[PDB]
Symmetry: C4
Subunit: 267 residues, 4 copies
Amino acid sequence: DFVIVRRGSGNEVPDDIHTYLREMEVKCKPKVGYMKKQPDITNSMRAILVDWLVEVGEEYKLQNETLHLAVNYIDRFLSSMSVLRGKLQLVGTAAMLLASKFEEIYPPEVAEFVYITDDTYTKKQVLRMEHLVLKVLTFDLAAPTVNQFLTQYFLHQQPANCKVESLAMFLGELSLIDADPYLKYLPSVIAGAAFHLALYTVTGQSWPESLIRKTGYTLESLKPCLMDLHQTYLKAPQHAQQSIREKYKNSKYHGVSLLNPPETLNL
Amino acid sequence: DFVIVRRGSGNEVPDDIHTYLREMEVKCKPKVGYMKKQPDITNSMRAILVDWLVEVGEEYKLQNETLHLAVNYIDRFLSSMSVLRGKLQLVGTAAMLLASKFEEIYPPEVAEFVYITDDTYTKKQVLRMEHLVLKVLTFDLAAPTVNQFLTQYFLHQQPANCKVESLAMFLGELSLIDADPYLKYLPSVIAGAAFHLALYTVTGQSWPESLIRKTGYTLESLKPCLMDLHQTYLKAPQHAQQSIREKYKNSKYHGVSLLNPPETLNL
Amino acid sequence: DFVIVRRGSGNEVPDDIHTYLREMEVKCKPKVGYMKKQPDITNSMRAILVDWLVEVGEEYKLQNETLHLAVNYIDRFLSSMSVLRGKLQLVGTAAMLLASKFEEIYPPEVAEFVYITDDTYTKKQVLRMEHLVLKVLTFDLAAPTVNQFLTQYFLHQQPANCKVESLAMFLGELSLIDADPYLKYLPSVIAGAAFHLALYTVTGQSWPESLIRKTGYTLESLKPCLMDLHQTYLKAPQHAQQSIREKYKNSKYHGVSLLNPPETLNL
Amino acid sequence: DFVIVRRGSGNEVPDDIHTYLREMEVKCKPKVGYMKKQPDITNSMRAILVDWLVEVGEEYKLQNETLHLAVNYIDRFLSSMSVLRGKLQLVGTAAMLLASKFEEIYPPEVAEFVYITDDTYTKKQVLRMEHLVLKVLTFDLAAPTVNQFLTQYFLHQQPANCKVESLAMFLGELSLIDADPYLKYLPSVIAGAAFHLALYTVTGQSWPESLIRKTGYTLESLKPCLMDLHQTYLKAPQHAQQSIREKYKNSKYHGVSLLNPPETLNL
């Protein structure tokens, strides 16, 4: 088999790409409800950590794939490991370093992450946590993300729309902040609800039949995830984490965070 | 309490953010009328200095928060200290260095500010003035800005508008240049007049009721500040300081400085 | 004769530029059907290599001329040389290095190409392959490209259109991926079909008469190439190589890859 | 008097700025018709040199003021000095280095200009020519440009228009290439014809009365310069120097080079 070597590694090599992602999203899934079993930290502390990683990604011009991978590493690590408040940010720093060295072409090194943490950790503390996360993750760094499923869904858009794609990615990142209602849904289901809600807002069209035959998810299958996602869109300006609404109000995303959300989804 | 360490420091930690800013904008307020008591410099000299700092911010891609903080440091320093003409620019250079090291992630160092001053000062002269400003400011560098109040007002916009937000920020920076009519108003009041004037120009809507219940400022409360702000908007092309109109004619701000100002505010 | 020295070298010096390109596009033409005679690699492997070079060009902000030249060097080298699977990517890496050092002002050096290959080759392996490609190409690096013919065609557009020019360049790069139906057409013919298909999609106008008198290609002359190019446009979202559709969905190209292709060309 | 030190030096210090520029544009004016007295070079060779400097400015992200100053240094130097073909490009290289060190904040150094010349000159050859140009120009580097007059004219636009300002700057740079019909006009007159032609094309409005009372130039006064400028706009796609049409087809200038020129100016 012929394969091209490169720096980005969160890509499915030649094999139906969508069929491979569905089989892998189940494996290495974060244990839902670990935050209740977590003694020191809570969901509100995780939402702040994930929101701070969004600002780190925007500072170093990191891809959206690097952000979703870092959040996947945090939830899986915290599901089987107990971390304190002061070390929680160290876990997120090392997780962002792992996702950068795995997906980015020119990733920020350890000295860069020590710099952005205002010199509160050492080069060894980040490397130890990075090595600790690797051992906990059993070195399985390839994980399907909401960004990966959204890319596959866009190939079936007829026609394509820049506002729909940008709004879908905006809704996808909002699910990373709140772990209470979204950690129980699969990345393919979250991307499906984000694609429909974005398409319904911009154009009014619904979940296309081409995606029904390809994914098997019907509109009723996505209805539970679509309900929680519709409320976050309505309560987005009131949410305490606003680093994603500021990110998606730029010309690069056609300012989709400024679009008014629908009052009713008619579902 | 859980807190995330970072480089930017002009941010209110978890505590109602708007209630905290209103209590702090009164503290460390610049003494109105210090320019009359200033023997050597005048308001026209300050307007040139502030306008030159806008060009410095655009040269190093500095945030708008860094600019407002630098102006806040200058007015407070000049309120209790007498500075000559030749040393006035040295004060603004050190104030911009303080605001950069306080808010920016990768701030320009001392060598950068000596470079942009065409090598008219030394590394010690900037560091001495920087240390002198810190002692005069009693190391209280956190100060509410017009940019901070505008960010809070945008969360209550229904719906949001990119042209209204950019025009509001444009009017906010124009108040920094002229100290004669705007140093007597609070940052929350200036941001309120800038938000209404921008909203009235683009869409015709007025000061929303959601901001009335949140801030307490009515349209009559903002009327004195709105009168002086409406004249600066009308006399903006005739003003001697045009570094802000050139800054806000770019695609990043949707070219709001080219929009025609309203002839009458109907107030 | 007066000539200005510079870094870019894929430019016709003063001499009718279009007449010179037509005479040179025939010389050093790739042998059609070499892939059938190629024992180890196939057309699907070449499509992946060319698609990976598009991502390399976007990573280093390389001009479109550098990409077309690299593909021209690969097809000519592979036409007279047999390469294995593992060395095929080494050929494309050296070809991209040659095109960069020939056209780019600040080209990526050998260390940059070794970096993007995930350190699978050495500095000598890239330099040896680079020297091997030069000897096979007889040091004739100047070759007319589809990008060069499109630039000449745009001067005769009445009026010019940003969407037509960007869509024409998008269709031009898609021909580089698939070598089976497009290696038998000349760059001037591919650019002609790409210009007409782009103009027909955006505005509905057809191949202008000003280009008929200048190039001699009529609409019937371009009809065979236009048929194969119309199918690639229709089957672009279904194609396995999507690095060009993602490249041309940016604001820099006015998002022409999101425009719906015509169902029938009426030819 | 209070003055702020900075890097850019082509700026009129506090003094009516438009009145100062009119008095200085006459001083140090290039001798019209020097090309006829020039034994070795011609106007077509100068047009290529000026067009190549436009590409140099776009490579290093240099301001439009730096380009106009470099052309002003070339015409004045060539008016009193005879230069050969091979040394003509060396003169333009040194002139661009002088204009960069005079106007730019971070200007390209001597090593940068030797690099872009494909290492055809030495560090001493550029420095000698730079020192030779300074002695010929009598160290008077401050000269009014078409860009400076256009900036003053935009303050009187009622209302302002982004397309009119970008098209005016596009027409202003085209006058720098052709020295035969434009070296006999003053920069204030060229900027006046460029402003009217741009305003007439986009909106249909004519030379405003506010600029008549400020500059004294009537539409009949600008008519001779407007005739030659209207033909260059019509014959712009046919011109041999196309580095400015490619520069002004970008989103930064709203793609004004793609706008269709008027058939008749109704004058």
